[PDB]
Amino acid sequence: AYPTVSEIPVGEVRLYQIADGVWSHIATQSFDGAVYPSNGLIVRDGDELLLIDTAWGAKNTAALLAEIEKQIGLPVTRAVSTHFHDDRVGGVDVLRAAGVATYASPSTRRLAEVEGNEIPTHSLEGLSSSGDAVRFGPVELFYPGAAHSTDNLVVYVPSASVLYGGCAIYELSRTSAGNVADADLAEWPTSIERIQQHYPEAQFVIPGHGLPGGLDLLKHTTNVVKAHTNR
Ligand SMILES: C[C@H](CS)C(=O)N[C@H](Cc1c[nH]c2ccccc12)C(=O)O
Ligand SMILES: [Zn+2]
Ligand SMILES: [Zn+2]
Ligand SMILES: [Zn+2]
Numbered sequence: 001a002y003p004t005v006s007e008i009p010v011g012e013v014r015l016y017q018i019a020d021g022v023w024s025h026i027a028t029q030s031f032d033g034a035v036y037p038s039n040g041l042i043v044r045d046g047d048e049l050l051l052i053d054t055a056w057g058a059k060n061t062a063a064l065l066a067e068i069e070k071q072i073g074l075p076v077t078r079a080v081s082t083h084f085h086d087d088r089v090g091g092v093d094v095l096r097a098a099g100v101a102t103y104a105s106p107s108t109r110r111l112a113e114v115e116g117n118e119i120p121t122h123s124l125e126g127l128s129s130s131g132d133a134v135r136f137g138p139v140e141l142f143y144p145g146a147a148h149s150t151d152n153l154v155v156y157v158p159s160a161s162v163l164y165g166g167c168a169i170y171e172l173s174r175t176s177a178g179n180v181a182d183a184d185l186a187e188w189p190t191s192i193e194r195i196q197q198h199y200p201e202a203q204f205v206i207p208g209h210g211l212p213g214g215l216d217l218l219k220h221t222t223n224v225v226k227a228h229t230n231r
Contacts, residue, residue: 002026002211005037013055013064015042015071018204018212019160021138023072025064027055029087038087038209041164042068042076043157045137051079051100052139052155052164054091061091065098076100080136081120082153082166084111085182087208092118103136105143107151127153131194142198144168145191146184148208156199163202163215165195170221171210177228178209185229189222 003014003026014026021044028037040053049072055064068076079095081088081104089112092102102120104112105127112119126134130145140156147168155164168191170178184191196218205217 003037005035008037010035011059011063013060013067015067018162018206019157022157022160022162024206024212025055025067027057027060027064029056029060036209039206041155041157041162041206042072043138044074045077047074048077049074050137050139051076051095053082053088053166054079054095056087057090058094061094064091065094078103078137079120080104080124080141080153080155081108082155082164083149083151084108084115084117085149085167085179086117088166089118089120092120096121105151105153108153111149111151130191131198133198142195144194144198145187147188147191148180149182150184154195156202161201161203162206163195163199163204164206165208165217167208168192168221169195169205169207169217170224171207172213172217172220173210175224177224180228185225188225192218192222 008028010028016024023042025040038056043050055061078101095102103122103124104120106123127143133142142154152168206212
């Protein structure tokens with residue numbers, strides 16, 4: 001039932017309902033010769049919507065906004081990017097031109113600028129130390145420490161028991177490390193343990209790329225990271 005790369009041509013976006021008022025968005029992109037899928041989140045906020053992450057590029061993110069209007073029909077008023085890579089901020093300029101207020105931590109905004117990537121407009125306070133959490137509309141934002149990147153955030157929806165891990169959490173079918181160029185391999189297992197301690201009641205866990213599952217995805221990611229460390 002969850003859509004895969006074989007079903008989404010590059011340039012198209014699908015939506016998947018996880019629980020009442022909570023969807024994932026799924027898109028695809030070419031990277032150095034191959035095609036990969038990528039997930040973000042949509043959370044209903046009264047009569048408005050909060051978006052978590054772009055759809056990995058300008059064309060994909062325009063298609064995302066069109067699909068949201070067709071299928072859900074409520075305005076996207078705010079967006080949060082969970083780290084500085086192009087699958088999270090690529091498309092921020094399209095969001096801004098459409099009137100969406102874009103947000104990220106000051107750490108993410110700095111790293112995006114250094115990389116020459118698109119830069120969310122607004123800065124999120126209260127997330128500078130490992131273990132920090134803040135409320136943002138219908139979600140909680142949590143900084144677990146450095147992992148896939150030094151700035152990575154995770155997102156929890158308390159009304160639905162949905163944990164969105166972004167690219168700090170791997171899907172079960174991935175048994176080898178992927179893009180680790182910006183990672184803190186030494187701290188990644190400790191950061192995962194902070195997530196487990198803060199969200200033990202999570203029922204649905206969504207990785208940055210691929211299939212959702214349960215809390216087992218956390219220990220799975222620690223196993224993959226430690227195996228890579230011992231390469
Ligand atoms: C451009 C993005 C930024 S996080 C990126 O590099 N993403 C890769 C995605 C990836 C690498 N190997 C795979 C195998 C199966 C499914 C996904 C992948 C990552 O997060 O490691
Ligand atoms: Zn990344
Ligand atoms: Zn990613
Ligand atoms: Zn495993």
